[PDB]
Amino acid sequence: AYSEKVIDHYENPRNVGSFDNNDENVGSGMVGAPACGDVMKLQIKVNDEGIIEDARFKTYGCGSAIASSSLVTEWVKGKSLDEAQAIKNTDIAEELELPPVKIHCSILAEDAIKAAIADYKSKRE
Amino acid sequence: AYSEKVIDHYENPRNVGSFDNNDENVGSGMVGAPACGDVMKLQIKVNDEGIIEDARFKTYGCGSAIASSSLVTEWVKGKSLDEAQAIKNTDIAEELELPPVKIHCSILAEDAIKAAIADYKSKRE
Amino acid sequence: MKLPIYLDYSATTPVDPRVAEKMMQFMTMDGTFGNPASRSHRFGWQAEEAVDIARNQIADLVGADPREIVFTSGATESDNLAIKGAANFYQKKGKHIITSKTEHKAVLDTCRQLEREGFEVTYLAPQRNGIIDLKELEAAMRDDTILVSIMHVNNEIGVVQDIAAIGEMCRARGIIYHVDATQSVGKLPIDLSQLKVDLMSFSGHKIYGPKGIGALYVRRKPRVRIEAQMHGGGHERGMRSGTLPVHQIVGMGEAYRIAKEEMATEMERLRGLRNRLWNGIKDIEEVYLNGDLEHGAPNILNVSFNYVEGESLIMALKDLAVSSGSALEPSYVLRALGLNDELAHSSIRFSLGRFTTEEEIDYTIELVRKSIGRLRDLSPLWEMYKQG
Amino acid sequence: MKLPIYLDYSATTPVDPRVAEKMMQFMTMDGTFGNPASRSHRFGWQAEEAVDIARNQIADLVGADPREIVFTSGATESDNLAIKGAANFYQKKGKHIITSKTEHKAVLDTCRQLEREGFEVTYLAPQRNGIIDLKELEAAMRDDTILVSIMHVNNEIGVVQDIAAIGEMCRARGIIYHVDATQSVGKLPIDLSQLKVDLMSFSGHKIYGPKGIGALYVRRKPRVRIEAQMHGGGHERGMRSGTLPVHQIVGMGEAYRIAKEEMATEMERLRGLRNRLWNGIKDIEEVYLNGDLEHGAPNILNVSFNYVEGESLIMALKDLAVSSGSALEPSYVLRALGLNDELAHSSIRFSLGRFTTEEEIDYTIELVRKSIGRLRDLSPLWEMYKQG
Numbered sequence A, B: 001a002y003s004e005k006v007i008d009h010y011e012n013p014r015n016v017g018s019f020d021n022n023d024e025n026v027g028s029g030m031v032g033a034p035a036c037g038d039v040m041k042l043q044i045k046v047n048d049e050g051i052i053e054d055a056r057f058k059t060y061g062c063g064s065a066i067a068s069s070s071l072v073t074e075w076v077k078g079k080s081l082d083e084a085q086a087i088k089n090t091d092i093a094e095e096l097e098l099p100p101v102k103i104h105c106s107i108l109a110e111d112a113i114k115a116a117i118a119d120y121k122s123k124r125e
Numbered sequence C, D: 001m002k003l004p005i006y007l008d009y010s011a012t013t014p015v016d017p018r019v020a021e022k023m024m025q026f027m028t029m030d031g032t033f034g035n036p037a038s039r040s041h042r043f044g045w046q047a048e049e050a051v052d053i054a055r056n057q058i059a060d061l062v063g064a065d066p067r068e069i070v071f072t073s074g075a076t077e078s079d080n081l082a083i084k085g086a087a088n089f090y091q092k093k094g095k096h097i098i099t100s101k102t103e104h105k106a107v108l109d110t111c112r113q114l115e116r117e118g119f120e121v122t123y124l125a126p127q128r129n130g131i132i133d134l135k136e137l138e139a140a141m142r143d144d145t146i147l148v149s150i151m152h153v154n155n156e157i158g159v160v161q162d163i164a165a166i167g168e169m170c171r172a173r174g175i176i177y178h179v180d181a182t183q184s185v186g187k188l189p190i191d192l193s194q195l196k197v198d199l200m201s202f203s204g205h206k207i208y209g210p211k212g213i214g215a216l217y218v219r220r221k222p223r224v225r226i227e228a229q230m231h232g233g234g235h236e237r238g239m240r241s242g243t244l245p246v247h248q249i250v251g252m253g254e255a256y257r258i259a260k261e262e263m264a265t266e267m268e269r270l271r272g273l274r275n276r277l278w279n280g281i282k283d284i285e286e287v288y289l290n291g292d293l294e295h296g297a298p299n300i301l302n303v304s305f306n307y308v309e310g311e312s313l314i315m316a317l318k319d320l321a322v323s324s325g326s327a328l329e330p331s332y333v334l335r336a337l338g339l340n341d342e343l344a345h346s347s348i349r350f351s352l353g354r355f356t357t358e359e360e361i362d363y364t365i366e367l368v369r370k371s372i373g374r375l376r377d378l379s380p381l382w383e384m385y386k387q388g
């Protein structure tokens, strides 16, 4: 019942891995949402003075949940702090063509990126 | 579920017909036994001074009931008043190999012959 | 030719070859043998798709929404589900049920059980022609009447009740109305989008499908609700649990798709034979037609011959495969019509079908004339009748 | 080879060719298509004889008297009939019923319905290995306990309950004992002349027979009595009304005759594969066997993998046709065992069968190793576990 893009991202996830949580260049946010009991850790490292250099993720959930956070890391690369700040789950769901049921994967994906950003801003200090 | 002899007698009943009820030579007895709602009319004409000349029947019931009274008319021919008097249903059932259910056809057959005899004896007078 | 001549299509019908060869493709390891319930792989999906096709094939034949189609094991289960499910659901509104004395056992025996469960059943007597008097049905209706079950075509005499008119009466008083349409599906036309019928039962093996498979129409609008009688997973929208017999369902769906096509011409052909048959025996001195030649099923003809015993008749018709008013009990149908036990006993139910031919109808016509006159020659009752 | 690999025999099994070709001879107009109920002609008789043969074929496989064999539409109906019929019959003695939390839905959902009918059901929790503790079963028994239902082989994890020992306990206290033996028939040996089992349910499509047909063993001595749930003519000795699906019944009878022969060798072959399979994956860091390798069905293997999400696992195993602990609800079986929702979610039920090969078992072994290590690379939980 999955979409083609989701299959692609699930079977070939882009940006798997993790960054040093004390990298100073890195803001990491790990958000889960027990309600289906998933959890995805996303984190960025920013090109000092705004723009985003690179991001990485790890996740635990459906292929949808996975493809969701995969897509996000891909989208975030080359973006700004704020450009990525205004991503909105809805856009993530449209792209992946998510069914009503797996809508929670977007909300979560958005939560993750927003949480990582907030972490970066908090550390400076 | 019928026996071969029964089929024979049912499909080729021996002695169908009726006698004159005032033949003076004839004793007729028509017995039915509501309980299954059948009815068979048997009647004889006797060779004055004992022996039986000829008999005839009509019946309404199973092929068993029919074959039963058929057999009886056949057996009674050439018999005596008393020889035929001691026929007994059981013998009729054995011959035709009647199942427990169609046992009532014997009892009835016997009833019929015995009733016809009694009728003859009654008229003389 | 070919003896004995099969005239018992009302008992069961031979699976049409097209129906069968379609079933074969949903059994073996190389076919589509999967379980529709398995919602996690190709096998379950392919089976699932075939199920839907059949569910629709069945729905299209009766003018219903495929979702309103609930699968059962047969018309018996359908009848049970229908009357039991609704009675237990709408019991708070009332506990009174109305039905015809001539209903198939699957219905009557269900009501006998319900009676011993606390419900109150009114078994209506039909007219001498089998037709139910609607005035009487109406008189029987009370504020606490919750369910009425009257069958379309009768399985013993083939009389046709005006289910349409009854549907109106029921809907009008807000009474659930069930119809045992097992003998009429694929024979008489049915459109549930016109009909005010709330619940309808069909099987397959009466219309050349496989035995052990049936359906139950449960109206979606206005929504009719029933309590499931078969629990274990809440399948069929929680009305009938249990694995869906794919090959059996395909069989049904296919037999219904065929029915939709050939029903028109075929049913008028049978009508010609049935007429032919009655033509050839109606002249016999004391023969009685049970039902309504005019308003009766084209494939069923049930007649009673007077002055000959039931079993002796059946035996005489060795060459035919028919059914009779015998069982330690005569046909309750024929006795609810107002026939005495003897006339009821000596009844033959000729049921025509796909393979019936004029040739055979003629053979039967003569065979019946032969037998009756012969058995009447042995009958002492016939004599008394013949003379005073 | 041939993808996807069918490892879902527990959901359903492909009708053995011999089973099918025998069924074909009881469908079309030239075959034996008659109705057994038609007790008045050749057609009904020939069908009737075939029915008996099958009824005996089934009886011989389980060591029962063919008269004790009641035909149903499947194991679901059997389970319903068994537990409902007896409960309503012996209700005056008591209204308490005992059963296992891990029972198939057909049983549990039946007891839920009965509870709302006034009965009292005690759902027993099994040990972490799925085995029921007999001491606990005994403690649960009261003077008013009338029925106990414990299944032979479990359909999710394949654990085997000592039905023999339980039978003794029940008989001893005069409690009716029912066994859902659907997963064990034709696999594990059954002899009702030794066993103290009062009621047993079997279906056909779990052992390579057609779907939509089953049976219910009702003990003759000492006589066990049940109230029919399907009314309409009092067929099957008045326990199950409705036309007997001949071609379906023949199918069953034939699949049981085959089972009796090939069951011995086949079951030990499956045991070798199942072992092989577990061998190839038991070394994976955090995998969990659900059931009892020693005392468990030879054809079922259910394992839980930690730190990977259920659905992502299923997706990874696209190449296999298996089943899982998913449905908005994890497997209640695996949660009654004492597994948390996550571990329960991420469970795979491998079920082997007739067509399974060592070749495929090897492919699966590697496929599972591949997938788990890969999904764990994406897992952030795996990392936290990996380091403190």
Ligand SMILES: *Cc1c(COP(=O)(O)O)cnc(C)c1O
Pocket: C010, C011, C073, C074, C075, C076, C077, C104, C106, C151, C153, C154, C155, C180, C182, C183, C203, C204, C206, C212, C213, C214, D242, D243
């Ligand atoms: C034969 C018949 C039934 C029985 O249904 P099966 O599908 O044979 O169980 C029910 N109602 C009528 C009117 C029938 O003729």
Ligand SMILES: *Cc1c(COP(=O)(O)O)cnc(C)c1O
Pocket: C242, C243, D010, D011, D073, D074, D075, D076, D077, D104, D106, D151, D153, D154, D155, D180, D182, D183, D203, D204, D206, D212, D213, D214
């Ligand atoms: C599949 C299964 C059932 C259902 O029986 P059907 O014949 O498929 O309706 C019941 N009990 C168990 C243990 C099963 O595995």
